[PDB]
Design an enzyme around this catalytic site. Structure first.
Site, PDB file in Angstrom:
ATOM      1  N   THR C   1      35.390  32.652  28.360  1.00 55.83           N
ATOM      2  CA  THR C   1      35.173  31.220  28.528  1.00 55.83           C
ATOM      3  C   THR C   1      33.866  30.767  27.906  1.00 55.83           C
ATOM      4  OG1 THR C   1      36.477  31.118  30.558  1.00 55.83           O
ATOM      5  CG2 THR C   1      34.912  29.342  30.201  1.00 55.83           C
ATOM      6  N   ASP C  17      36.254  25.710  25.850  1.00 50.42           N
ATOM      7  CA  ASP C  17      37.354  26.311  25.120  1.00 50.42           C
ATOM      8  C   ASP C  17      38.614  26.242  25.978  1.00 50.42           C
ATOM      9  OD1 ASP C  17      36.343  28.374  26.921  1.00 50.42           O
ATOM     10  OD2 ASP C  17      37.708  29.719  25.858  1.00 50.42           O
ATOM     11  N   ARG C  19      40.874  28.880  26.479  1.00 42.97           N
ATOM     12  CA  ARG C  19      41.450  30.248  26.543  1.00 42.97           C
ATOM     13  C   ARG C  19      41.227  30.889  27.912  1.00 42.97           C
ATOM     14  NH1 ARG C  19      39.791  34.925  22.261  1.00 42.97           N
ATOM     15  NH2 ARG C  19      42.003  34.927  21.708  1.00 42.97           N
ATOM     16  N   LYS C  33      39.649  23.613  31.193  1.00 45.74           N
ATOM     17  CA  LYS C  33      38.450  24.017  31.909  1.00 45.74           C
ATOM     18  C   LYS C  33      37.516  22.852  32.195  1.00 45.74           C
ATOM     19  CE  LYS C  33      38.789  28.306  29.318  1.00 45.74           C
ATOM     20  NZ  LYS C  33      38.070  29.420  28.652  1.00 45.74           N
ATOM     21  N   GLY C  47      34.359  31.416  35.068  1.00 44.10           N
ATOM     22  CA  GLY C  47      34.501  32.376  36.149  1.00 44.10           C
ATOM     23  C   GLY C  47      35.968  32.609  36.476  1.00 44.10           C
ATOM     24  N   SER C 129      31.668  33.521  29.314  1.00 41.16           N
ATOM     25  CA  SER C 129      31.419  34.731  28.535  1.00 41.16           C
ATOM     26  C   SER C 129      30.752  34.410  27.203  1.00 41.16           C
ATOM     27  CB  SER C 129      32.726  35.491  28.318  1.00 41.16           C
ATOM     28  OG  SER C 129      33.690  34.673  27.681  1.00 41.16           O
ATOM     29  N   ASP C 166      32.919  35.218  20.938  1.00 39.26           N
ATOM     30  CA  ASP C 166      33.321  35.819  22.202  1.00 39.26           C
ATOM     31  C   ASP C 166      34.831  36.007  22.234  1.00 39.26           C
ATOM     32  OD1 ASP C 166      32.095  36.567  24.955  1.00 39.26           O
ATOM     33  OD2 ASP C 166      33.897  35.422  25.467  1.00 39.26           O
ATOM     34  N   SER C 169      36.656  33.814  24.870  1.00 37.20           N
ATOM     35  CA  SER C 169      36.802  32.422  24.481  1.00 37.20           C
ATOM     36  C   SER C 169      37.638  32.312  23.215  1.00 37.20           C
ATOM     37  CB  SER C 169      35.440  31.771  24.245  1.00 37.20           C
ATOM     38  OG  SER C 169      34.529  32.112  25.271  1.00 37.20           O
TER      39      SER C 169
HETATM   40  C1  LIG Z   1      36.440  32.111  31.609  1.00 34.76           C
HETATM   41  O1  LIG Z   1      35.379  32.372  32.153  1.00 34.76           O
HETATM   42  C2  LIG Z   1      37.707  32.844  31.980  1.00 34.76           C
HETATM   43  C3  LIG Z   1      38.882  31.856  31.940  1.00 34.76           C
HETATM   44  O2  LIG Z   1      40.018  32.430  32.595  1.00 34.76           O
HETATM   45  C4  LIG Z   1      38.572  30.511  32.610  1.00 34.76           C
HETATM   46  C5  LIG Z   1      38.177  30.611  34.064  1.00 34.76           C
HETATM   47  C6  LIG Z   1      37.693  29.495  34.598  1.00 34.76           C
HETATM   48  C7  LIG Z   1      38.232  28.204  34.032  1.00 34.76           C
HETATM   49  C8  LIG Z   1      39.674  28.477  33.624  1.00 34.76           C
HETATM   50  C9  LIG Z   1      39.730  29.516  32.505  1.00 34.76           C
HETATM   51  N1  LIG Z   1      37.645  33.530  33.254  1.00 34.76           N
HETATM   52  C10 LIG Z   1      38.170  34.748  33.227  1.00 34.76           C
HETATM   53  O3  LIG Z   1      38.422  35.449  34.193  1.00 34.76           O
HETATM   54  C11 LIG Z   1      38.405  35.163  31.815  1.00 34.76           C
HETATM   55  C12 LIG Z   1      37.536  36.342  31.423  1.00 34.76           C
HETATM   56  C13 LIG Z   1      36.848  35.830  30.167  1.00 34.76           C
HETATM   57  O4  LIG Z   1      36.640  34.460  30.501  1.00 34.76           O
HETATM   58  C14 LIG Z   1      37.888  33.993  31.002  1.00 34.76           C
HETATM   59  C15 LIG Z   1      38.805  33.642  29.839  1.00 34.76           C
END
Ligand SMILES: *C(=O)[C@]1([C@@H](O)[C@@H]2C=CCCC2)NC(=O)[C@@H]2CCO[C@@]21C
Lengths: 205, 229, 230, 235, 234, 191, 230, 225, 230
Positions: C1, C17, C19, C33, C47, C129, C166, C169
């Protein structure tokens, strides 16, 4: 190893041309042992809503019964069937109420919008982090396999026949690469007029 | 220990506290509601304590959610408590289900709360009757919720001061085919009928649900625009 | 993220992003997000997706109930205090690393709220991330009182930096520009414009696909039944 | 304290809870509700409490669905009726969650009557001034119709009435009620009894028809305003 | 007034006095202590011959050594004897010894006056039962009297129930400190027969002895009750 | 890890269980009836710690009797199976009952349910809890025919139990087999 | 007269709290206790009309310790008097637990008036038929709480029988101009002048909080002023 | 009369009529006498015998080693208060390891009785306690009242016929401070004798060094003279 | 919670609420429980509209496979008593594995009624219960009558409800010390018929044989026994 891996599951949902298709492996396995080939993971929640619970059989039945309790109460108190999005939020609430003792099931809601009849896929994780894929929603121990096969295979605007075609073929490809999943498949094609429940043949090993 | 119920059946099966709360409603300020074909309206004669009162700070017509709105007649504070509870129920319904609480669901929650307060001990029934407007699938809906927790569904009604005369006026001058503008005019005329002296847009609050199915409180400019015609 | 909110002269630009990964696999390629809190406040969160979605919905409900009962515009520091208190009372178990971005009477405010409840008012913030790949752009291109378009481009480029650098992301850059409807009027209505898929990186799209899809799996149907949809 | 307590959970010199007798009197002042069992179902009918030229008969007032197999007509306080209907729905769905089976009608009636009795024996709270005609179907005892009281007493009835002129309706049913009737016959019987006891506007009446079919199962349909009008115009 | 825990202008707990009256409405019971043992003689009121007399037992064995006879409300007395039995077994469990007669009497008395009303959640009214607690403690028979007020007194001889006052008057010149257990049984049965409204019979009487020689509270069988009623002067 | 094996027939259910109770390395008893007759119609074979199995069996039997007495109707086999499933689902999350069961009931139709401590409920033609399933499922698959006679059913259950005895390292010293049919639960000997 | 005098929370149609008025009557029945703020300290003097000659000389206190700096003269229903004394001690202890410092008579009086008010504000409580004069030299405070819960700081407070005349006499002296040791004879003369002849044996329970006491409460020593009279 | 409803109700005169009824319930108890010398404290009382062959109900109780209480009124309420006081002594001998002061016990029992009189649904204890203690505070005598207050005395009489005992104590009040243990016990027994309507009189005597002890019946014969 | 001590003593020493609960019982239908050496029989008269209601609502209930239970009084208070008794039978099985003693379960029902007479805010059960059954631990059929007061007494033949005195007289007259099972049936049936002017269509008769469960008499055998008694 893992509690989710205890009961091998493989639930798929795909979006077609004003039709959805929710398929699921028919195996109740206990880790590496096949207990049954008649395990229902897809449940009809509403006339135009089907819920496939990919995960722990315990939590598949618990979540299905809890969401039949919630949906029946909602439809009694409101004299109206629950919407696919309303039911998606209901499942999200149900899972996040147990967020810190989560149900080990990923729900896959395959429904048709009440009026437009558009496909509605909604797959969440154990704790209701719902996604709304316009193409395909996968869940269960075959998650990577289903994602891989459906990314290439799913095409937009699939009629009920073509939508069943990939739902079945793509689910077969997923289950045949998952050891703890398979032993027959069941595909519910939800359309404007009818629900077609086709029991498809997968590998029984 | 006051856990005993102060609302109890009388010798004849008449909940004296319910009748007392209904009388409080009958002396709580006239509020009218009119269900049109393409919407519903709830107005009230919100004559302030004095010209020094700021109207916006104690609006009688209020939002429960984007689609549902409420006016009351009776104890203002009881209405505010029920309104906070209904808004909290609507936001809880949105959290659990992603949509605003349906109009009849809001009405049933208000009715359940009021019945609860008519049954549990140490409390009196809410001395307000609520006119709740909002859209259901089959169209607009107006709902009376009494202190007893019994909820009528009305095409039009008034339930405040001189509400019998105003309900006869509505019985005499209401038609289903009325539009939202026609419904607002009917509500304003009903308020005029039951109000002493010239009615002013300052002294009445109007909240309408229209084809958009969203509840909106008419600003004083819009209310005056309706009054002038 | 990769989530990044910055404060420009006229308001706040939040970006994220799209993803969501279920481990090493991209579960969602259009993940939302950026969460609407109130008309003036948007929270972009990282998260745990469930934790972020639920806490943002809960605080949006709290501030909608606040704005209804009290008639008051939710404050960005108010939303941030509620979020930080809720995340602290859960001792970081609600893994919602949030970036609140709004405009209240105090002007445009961007706050970070760590999953453990530690908040902080910062001009530009990047979480997730790819938060580092984003913050680099934010570090190099943010300046006091930048216009809306430059902040939009900077936040989109920071989300794109997170997307490319990343693995957690990717996909598109969704923006949300909180701004006053009349920038010259500090008392004007705070509106938001959500730019879904503000950036759609073409080099990150599906560049190949079998036109005749080759498949040698044949479906054998054990049993078929048709049931009416009513 | 307790100077202004009504002794709702206290006996009278005669031995009857005067709050339950006043609740029963309140029911007798409420719109008539009639239940009639036929071959494979039960027809419930009721008189709406809110009946005016302005009242919008949008949804059933005296009639409520408890589950796919249970429906309830109510005489008495409609608010207490709504509360107990919510409780009955929650209990039926709790039994469905626990046993994956539709709650037997006698057990739901026993649950609502335990609630109503607890209000007459504990807590010093006001009794539920409602009498339910709980129609329903369960595999155990077929299609059943139960008459509940504010005391928490229930009894299966082939056909019965509650509310205003409940005795007149009971006498009319006794003179006219037959066994193994059809849905149409029982519905016409309810129409006749209502017309004699009760004005008589179709929109003032509510109808629900529980019907057990071996194919579809136990189906509950609360007749809509159009259906009620069409059914009443046939008398 | 109108509340259970109210004091009359005379300084009496009105519910306590009314429970004393309820005891005065209960069946008579005479407890005669003698150095050999404590003997209960109790009027068993039989509304019909179909009433199983053993089931309307007004005498309850609290423990092996201690027993109790009720007067007044049989259900409140059942609660009191249940508490006493639990107390006696708890005492045996906690101190590896039979509970003292005074100790169990004091425990049930402390329970007696714990009635209350008006406070959020306890019994709501005093026990309408007076107990004649008796038993063998340290090779000695102890006889105690508990009344609804919660006061207990050690007694050489006591009477509870409808004939309580008349029984005490008869015991005035009939009770002595050195009587044999034979004489104690005779006196208890004579006083009961005098203060009941029916001819004494083994079936309408319940006799029980906390016997020092056996160190145990036993309840007499029909044969023993006949063995006592036969000896009576009438 | 106790061997309970269920086999559902057209109008009967053969439910067998390890009859050897144990404390540590000691076989305390060789005829312990691990199959719990919750109702006259339902026999619940239980695999788990003897204490957990006994307590869960007593709770379920008491609840079945309480349902039969509160309401003048006996629980079905699906209703009882889902009640057991609800009990196990409650337990797992809070205070888990570590018992894997096979619920065999006849309520006019034979029923065999695979239940586990977590709460997975599945109607099965045949099944087993413990490690015995790894040994008996195949034999059932190899030898079960639809419409199996009661004598053929006893032969097949005997074959499965013999496979448990021969191939399972911890071979139960014996089994208690119960036939659940229209006549109720009758203990039988397979020889 | 009317039935508005049974329930403490009930208001008379004139707005009178009849139960509170009867608690005030209970205060007025009791022998007067007073307090005066002086240059060197605060002097609390309580008139003890000894009902029996057998009462311990110097016993049965009406002035009580609340804190190592706060004393409490009490008037009215002695059970309520000591109940409020112990509740004030508990409030001071809780205040120290929550805040570390020692409580001040103004806010101690506020906290104890909270209980006074709760007595007649929530049902199931009896209004305290006691007036409590909290004195503290270290806080230069003399706050008297009345049965209603009304608490006021006084230059010279007095409550009980003949309290109006006692206040009128306290008014004749500028107490802050003088110290406690020269205030003792004046207050003693006041109470002796107002002491009723019917009570033969009695005492003047004087306490002071002064620099001579280092701000600690202390009964006025017998040598300084023999409290006992006939 | 009409305001004699609850212990929570004040009469228009400021009087709690239920509290006064409980105080009378104390005044209807058997004659209790308490005395206090500079070295010893004494509580004595004619125990009540409900029946001819019933024993005299115990009236003197030992709360702690140097603390005892003589109850007057509902003996069950007296036993409840004795339980409460013994718990307080056991929690003061647990928290601090020393014996509590009888003044502190009087404070606690007064607080409990006042809380009984201040909250609805509770009744004032229908028993008044003559508590004698000895310790660092010296010998101290407290007459705790149902209303929730304790009066410290050098001597005191409560219960029925207590006016004669009070008169005797007033006559000999100035003798008590120097009276020895034996002389204080003699004064107690001779204040009770004036109340006579011994085997009924029970007397608990405590001293600064002497632990509280209960003498009954013939044990008190030596103190009659 | 609510605690208004519904059951209090009166000046004459009577619990008027228990008198009113007895009145409620005496307005209930007549029940007649009789016993033989090996079989117990319960006959409850039924008042109903035969043409319009199902006679399947029985006053006779089965607390356990060995405990039969009938009641006279409020049907809801009786339903609560029967529900608690069934729960207690199953809990006794859970705690002991032995069938609950008929004396034990009768004591439990009487103690439920007694607790309602003792618990504040609890209305005494307006029900008198006939707890009958068989104990293997005693080899004796038992018939206890628990009253609203909470008192339970075993009887050789007992009746409750309306006309209880007439049926009691009939039982006393026509009771045999060593009746056979059919003689017990005849006694119970005749005792109920003495006050009922209707046959099998009105009466409801159940029975429990030695080591047996509760069996409801048919409408054919009951009528035959009714005719034989006459
Ligand atoms: C981002 O941190 C991420 C996404 O799933 C994100 C989570 C919070 C908002 C919705 C989408 N969280 C995760 O567990 C994965 C790991 C890498 O970052 C994610 C894509």
């Amino acid at each position: 190893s893992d509690i989710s891996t205890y009961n091998g599951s493989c639930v798929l949902a795909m979006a077609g041309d004003h039709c959805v298709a929710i398929a699921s492996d028919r195996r109740l396995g206990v880790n590496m042992l096949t207990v049954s080939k008649d395990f229902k993971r897809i449940f009809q929640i509403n006339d135009r809503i089907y819920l496939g619970l990919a995960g722990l059989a315990t939590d598949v039945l618990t979540v299905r019964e809890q969401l039949r309790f919630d949906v029946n109460l909602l439809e009694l108190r409101e004299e109206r069937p629950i919407d696919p999005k309303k039911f998606m939020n209901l499942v999200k609430s149900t899972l996040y109420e147990k967020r810190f003792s989560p149900f080990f099931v990923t729900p896959v809601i395959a429904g048709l919008l009440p009026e437009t009849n558009e496909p509605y896929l909604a797959a969440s994780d154990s704790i209701g982090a719902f996604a709304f894929p316009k193409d395909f929603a996968v869940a269960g121990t075959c998650e990577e396999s289903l994602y891989g096969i459906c990314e290439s295979a799913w095409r937009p605007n699939m009629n009920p026949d073509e939508l069943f075609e990939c739902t079945a073929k793509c689910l077969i490809a997923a289950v045949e690469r998952d050891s703890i999943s398979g032993w027959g498949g069941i595909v519910y094609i939800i359309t404007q007029d009818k629900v077609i429940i086709k029991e498809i043949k997968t590998r029984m090993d | 220990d006051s856990d005993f119920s102060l609302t109890t059946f009388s010798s004849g099966g008449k909940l004296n506290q319910i009748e007392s709360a209904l009388k409080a409603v009958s002396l709580g300020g006239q509020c009218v509601g009119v269900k049109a074909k393409n919407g519903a309206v709830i107005a009230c004669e919100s004559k302030p304590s004095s010209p020094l009162v700021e109207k916006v700070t104690n609006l009688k017509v209020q939002k429960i959610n984007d689609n549902v709105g409420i006016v009351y007649s009776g104890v203002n504070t009881d209405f505010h408590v029920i309104l906070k509870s209904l808004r909290k129920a609507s936001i809880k319904y949105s959290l659990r289900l992603g949509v605003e609480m349906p109009t009849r669901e809001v009405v049933k929650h208000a009715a359940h709360k009021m019945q609860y307060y008519t049954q549990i001990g140490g409390v009196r029934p809410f001395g307000v009757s609520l006119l709740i407007i909002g859209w259901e699938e089959l169209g607009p809906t107006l709902w009376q919720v009494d202190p007893s927790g019994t909820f009528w569904a009305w095409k039009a009604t008034a339930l405040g001061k001189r509400s019998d005369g105003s309900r006869t006026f509505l019985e005499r001058r209401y038609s289903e085919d009325q539009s939202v503008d026609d419904a607002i005019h009917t509500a304003i005329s009903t308020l005029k009928e039951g109000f002493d002296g010239q009615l002013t847009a300052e002294l009445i609050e109007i909240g309408v649900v229209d084809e958009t199915r969203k509840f909106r409180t008419l600003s004083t400019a819009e209310i005056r625009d309706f009054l002038t015609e | 993220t990769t989530i990044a909110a910055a404060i420009f002269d006229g308001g706040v630009v939040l970006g994220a992003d799209t993803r969501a990964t279920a481990g090493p696999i991209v579960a969602v390629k259009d993940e939302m997000k950026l969460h609407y809190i109130s008309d003036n406040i948007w929270v972009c969160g990282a998260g745990i997706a469930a934790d972020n979605d639920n806490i943002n919905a809960v605080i949006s409900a709290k501030l909608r109930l606040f704005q209804m009962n009290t008639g008051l515009q939710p404050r960005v520091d108010q939303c941030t205090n509620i979020l930080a208190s809720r995340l602290f009372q859960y001792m970081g178990y609600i893994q919602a690393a949030l970036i609140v971005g709004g405009i209240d009477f105090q002007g445009p405010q961007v706050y970070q709220v760590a999953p453990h409840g530690s908040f902080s008012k910062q001009p530009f913030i990047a979480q997730g991330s790819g938060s580092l790949a984003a913050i680099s752009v934010l570090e190099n291109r943010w300046h006091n009182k930048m216009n809306e378009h430059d902040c939009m481009e900077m936040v989109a480029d920071a989300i794109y930096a997170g997307i490319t650098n990343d693995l957690g992301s990717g996909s598109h850059v969704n923006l949300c520009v909180i701004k006053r409807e009349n920038p010259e009027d500090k008392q004007s209505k705070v509106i938001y414009t959500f730019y879904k898929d503000y950036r759609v990186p073409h080099e990150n799209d599906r560049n190949f696909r079998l036109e005749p899809q080759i498949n040698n799996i044949d479906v054998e149907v054990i049993k078929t039944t048709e049931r009416p949809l009513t | 304290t307790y100077r202004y307590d009504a002794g709702t959970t206290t006996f009278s010199s005669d031995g009857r809870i005067l709050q339950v007798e006043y609740a029963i009197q309140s029911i007798n002042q409420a719109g008539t509700a009639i239940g009639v069992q036929f071959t494979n179902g039960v027809v419930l009918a009721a008189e709406k409490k809110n009946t005016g030229r302005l009242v919008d008969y949008l949804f059933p007032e005296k009639m409520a669905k408890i589950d796919g197999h249970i429906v309830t007509a109510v005489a008495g306080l409609t608010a207490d009726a709504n509360t107990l209907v919510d409780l009955m729905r929650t209990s039926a769905q709790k039994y469905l969650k626990t046993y994956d089976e539709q709650m037997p009608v006698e057990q739901l009636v026993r649950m609502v009557c335990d609630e109503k009795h607890s209000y007459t024996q504990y807590g010093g709270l006001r009794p539920y001034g409602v009498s339910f005609l709980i129609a329903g179907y369960d595999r155990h005892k077929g299609c059943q119709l139960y008459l509940t009281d504010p005391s928490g007493n229930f009894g299966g009835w082939k056909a019965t009435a509650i509310g205003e002129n409940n005795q007149t309706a009971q006498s009319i049913l006794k003179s006219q009620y037959k066994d193994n009737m059809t849905a149409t016959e029982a519905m016409d019987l309810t129409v006749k009894v209502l017309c004699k006891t009760l004005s008589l506007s179709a929109d003032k009446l509510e109808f629900a028809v529980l019907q057990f079919r071996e194919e579809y199962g136990p189906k509950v349909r609360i007749l809509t305003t159009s259906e009620v009008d069409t059914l009443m115009k046939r008398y | 007034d109108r509340n259970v825990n109210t004091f009359s202008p005379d300084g009496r707990l009105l519910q306590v006095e009314y429970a004393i009256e309820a005891v005065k409405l209960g069946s008579s019971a005479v407890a005669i202590l003698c150095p050999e043992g404590v003997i209960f003689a109790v009027e068993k009121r039989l509304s019909s011959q179909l009433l199983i007399a053993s089931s309307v037992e007004k005498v309850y064995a609290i423990d092996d050594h201690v027993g109790v006879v009720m007067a007044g409300l049989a259900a409140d007395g059942r609660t009191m004897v249940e508490h006493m039995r639990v107390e006696a077994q708890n005492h045996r469990f906690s101190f590896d010894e039979p509970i003292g007669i005074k100790a169990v009497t004091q425990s049930v008395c402390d329970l007696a006056l714990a009635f209350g009303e008006g406070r959020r959640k306890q019994m709501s009214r005093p026990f309408g039962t007076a107990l004649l607690v008796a038993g063998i403690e340290n090779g000695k028979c102890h006889l105690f009297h508990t009344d609804p007020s919660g006061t207990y007194t050690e007694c050489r001889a006591r009477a509870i129930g409808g004939g309580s006052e008349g029984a005490e008057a008869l015991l005035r010149d009939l009770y002595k400190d050195g009587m044999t257990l034979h004489e104690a049984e005779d006196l208890a049965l004579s006083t009961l027969r005098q203060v009941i409204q029916e001819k004494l019979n083994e079936n309408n009487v319940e006799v029980a002895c906390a016997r020092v020689s056996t160190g145990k509270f036993e309840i007499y069988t029909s044969e023993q009750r006949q063995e006592i009623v036969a000896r009576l002067p009438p | 890890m106790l061997s309970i094996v269920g086999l559902q027939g057209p109008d009967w259910v053969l439910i067998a269980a390890d009859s050897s109770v144990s404390s540590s390395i000691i076989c305390m008893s060789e005829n312990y009836d691990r199959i719990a007759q919750l109702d006259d119609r339902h026999a619940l074979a239980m695999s788990g710690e003897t204490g957990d199995c006994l307590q869960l069996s007593e709770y379920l039997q008491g609840n079945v009797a309480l349902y039969k007495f509160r309401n003048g109707v006996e629980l079905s086999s699906d209703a009882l199976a889902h009640f057991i499933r609800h009990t196990m689902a409650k337990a797992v999350r809070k205070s888990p009952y570590e018992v894997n069961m096979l619920l065999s009931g006849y309520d006019g139709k034979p029923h065999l349910y695979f239940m586990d401590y977590l709460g997975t409920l599945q109607s099965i033609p045949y099944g087993a809890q413990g490690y015995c399933q790894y040994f008996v499922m195949s034999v059932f698959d190899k030898h079960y025919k639809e419409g199996l006679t009661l004598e053929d059913g006893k032969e097949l259950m005997k074959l499965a139990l013999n496979q448990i005895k021969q191939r399972f390292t911890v071979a139960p010293h014996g089994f208690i087999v119960k036939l659940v049919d229209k006549n109720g639960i009758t203990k039988i000997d397979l020889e | 007269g009317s039935g508005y005098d049974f329930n403490p929370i009930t208001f008379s149609p004139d707005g009178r709290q009849f139960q509170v008025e009867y608690a005030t009557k209970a205060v007025e029945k009791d022998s007067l206790a007073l307090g005066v703020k002086c240059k060197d300290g605060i002097l609390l003097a309580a008139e003890k009309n000894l009902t029996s000659t057998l009462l311990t000389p110097g016993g049965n206190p009406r002035i009580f310790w609340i804190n190592d700096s706060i004393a409490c003269a009490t008037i009215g229903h002695r059970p309520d008097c000591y109940s409020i004394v112990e509740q004030s001690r508990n409030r001071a202890e809780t205040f120290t637990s929550n805040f570390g410092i020692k409580i001040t008579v103004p806010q101690l009086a506020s906290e104890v008036s909270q209980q006074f008010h709760l007595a007649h504000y929530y049902q199931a409580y009896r209004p305290f038929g006691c007036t409590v004069i909290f004195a503290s030299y270290k806080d230069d405070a003399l706050y008297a709480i009345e049965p209603s819960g009304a608490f006021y700081g006084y230059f010279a407070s007095c409550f009980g029988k003949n309290s109006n005349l006692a206040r009128a006499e306290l008014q004749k002296t500028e107490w802050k101009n003088i110290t406690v040791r020269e205030a003792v004879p004046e207050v003693a003369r006041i109470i002796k002048s107002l002491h009723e002849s019917q009570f033969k044996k009695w005492e003047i329970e004087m306490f002071w909080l002064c620099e001579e006491t280092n701000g600690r409460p202390q009964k006025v020593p017998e040598d300084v002023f023999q409290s006992r009279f006939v | 009369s009409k305001y004699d409803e609850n212990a929570t109700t004040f009469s228009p005169e400021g009087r709690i009529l239920q509290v006064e009824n409980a105080m009378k319930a104390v005044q209807q108890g058997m004659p209790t006498v308490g005395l206090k010398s500079k070295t010893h404290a004494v509580i004595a009382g004619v125990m009540h015998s409900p029946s001819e062959f019933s024993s005299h109900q115990p009236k003197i109780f030992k709360i702690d080693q140097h603390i005892g209480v003589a109850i007057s009124g509902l003996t069950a309420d007296g036993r409840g208060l004795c339980k409460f006081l013994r718990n307080e002594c056991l929690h003061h001998t647990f928290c601090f390891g020393t014996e509590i002061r009888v003044a502190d016990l009087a404070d606690t029992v007064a607080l409990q009785s006042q809380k009984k009189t201040s909250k609805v649904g509770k009744r004032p204890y229908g028993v008044g306690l003559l508590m004698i203690g000895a310790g660092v505070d010296g010998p101290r005598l407290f007459e705790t009242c149902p209303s929730g207050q304790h009066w410290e005395y050098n001597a005191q009489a409560i219960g029925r016929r207590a006016q004669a005992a009070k008169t005797y104590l007033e006559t000999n009040l100035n003798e008590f401070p120097d009276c020895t243990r034996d002389q204080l016990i003699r004064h107690a027994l001779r204040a009770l004798n004036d109340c006579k309507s011994l085997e009924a009189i029970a007397l608990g005597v405590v001293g600064i060094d002497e632990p509280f002890t209960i003498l009954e019946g013939p044990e008190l014969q030596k103190y009659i003279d | 919670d609510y605690t208004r001590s519904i059951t209090r003593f009166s000046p004459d020493g009577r619990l008027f609420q228990i008198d009113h609960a007895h009145a409620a019982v005496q307005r209930g239908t007549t029940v007649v429980a009789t016993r033989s050496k090996d079989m117990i029989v319960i006959a409850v008269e039924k008042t109903a509209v035969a043409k319009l209601q199902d006679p399947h609502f029985s006053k006779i209930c089965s607390l356990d496979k060995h405990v039969m239970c009938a009641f006279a009084g409020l049907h809801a208070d009786a339903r609560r008593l029967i529900q608690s008794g069934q729960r207690q039978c199953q809990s006794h099985r859970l705690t002991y594995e032995d069938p609950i003693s008929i004396e034990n379960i009768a004591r439990y029902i009487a103690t439920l009624q007694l607790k309602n007479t003792q618990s504040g805010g609890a209305r005494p059960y307006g029900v008198s219960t006939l707890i009958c059954g068989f104990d293997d631990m005693t080899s004796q059929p038992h018939i206890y009558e628990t009253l609203p007061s909470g008192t339970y007494a075993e009887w050789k033949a007992r009746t409750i409800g309306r006309h209880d005195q007439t049926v009691m007289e009939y039982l006393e007259k026509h009771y045999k010390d060593d009746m056979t099972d059919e003689e017990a049936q005849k006694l119970a049936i005749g005792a109920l018929l003495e006050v009922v002017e209707n046959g099998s269509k009105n009466l409801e008769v159940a029975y429990m044989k030695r080591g047996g469960t509760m069996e409801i008499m048919a409408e054919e055998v009951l009528d035959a026994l009714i005719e034989s008694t006459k």
